[PDB]
Amino acid sequence: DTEAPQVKSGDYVVYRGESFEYYAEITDNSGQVNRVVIRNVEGGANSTYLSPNWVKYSTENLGRPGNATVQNPLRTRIFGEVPLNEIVNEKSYYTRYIVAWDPSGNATQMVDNANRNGLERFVLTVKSQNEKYDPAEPSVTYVNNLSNLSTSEREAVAAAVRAANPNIPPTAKITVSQNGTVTITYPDKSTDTIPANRVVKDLQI
Ligand SMILES: CO[C@@H]1O[C@H](CO)[C@H](O)[C@H](O[C@]2(C(=O)O)C[C@H](O)[C@@H](NC(C)=O)[C@H]([C@H](O)[C@H](O)CO)O2)[C@H]1O
Ligand SMILES: [Ca+2]
Ligand code: NA
Secondary structure, three states: OOOOOEEEOOEEEEEOOOEEEEEEEEEOOOOOOOEEEEEOOOOOOOOOOOOOOOOEEEEOOOOOOOOOEOOEOEEEEEEEEOOOOOOOOOOOEEEEEEEEEOOOOOEOOOOOOHHHEOOOEEEEEEEOHHHHOOOOOOOOEEEOOOOOOOHHHHHHHHHHHHHHOOOOOOOOEEEEOOOOOEEEEOOOOOEEEEOHHHOEEEOOO
């Protein structure tokens, strides 16, 4: 319904142990939107049920003339904190709908089709925490023997990786094995690994 408010959302990827914040933009031909609900598909016209319960949202400047124009769309904040105990797999996404109402009571229609994703329909994808980070591997630590790093050398590699990766969670644990393999264990206990060849060299040859 192009006489109902129109919504532009996005690909709302979120990560265990991390806060998220996205904005959707809403316009209406009347220039005004009075109400915005984000909801699961189930329930019928009056439902506001939305899960997971940690998905929050808010819309400032509701119910004012000109609050929802093409040149200055209404914005809805979609935010929350993803718990560490969320299940993560290829199916750990949640398809949700943004419904907005204009002064005539026309509400954005919910159409159950993936071609509407990024409009009034959006997918909230929950990923493990390691997926938020792409550890930098540009550091180089020279060790005596690549097949047998000492404790000091293992700590040196971990410190080099940390120094190259100020953005990874401070409480993520960087450990290095006896052959220089790096494991980054995130707060949600997911891991990234860095092969030794990318962080360690020796002068044995
Ligand atoms: C009516 O059936 C639902 O229709 C919606 C679209 O309107 C979805 O297709 C939904 O399926 C999913 C989804 O929300 O995309 C498929 C996901 O794999 C499920 N996630 C998990 C972690 O199992 C969700 C989830 O079960 C649901 O969103 C709970 O509110 O459902 C259809 O079930
Ligand atoms: Ca309208
Ligand atoms: Na990663």
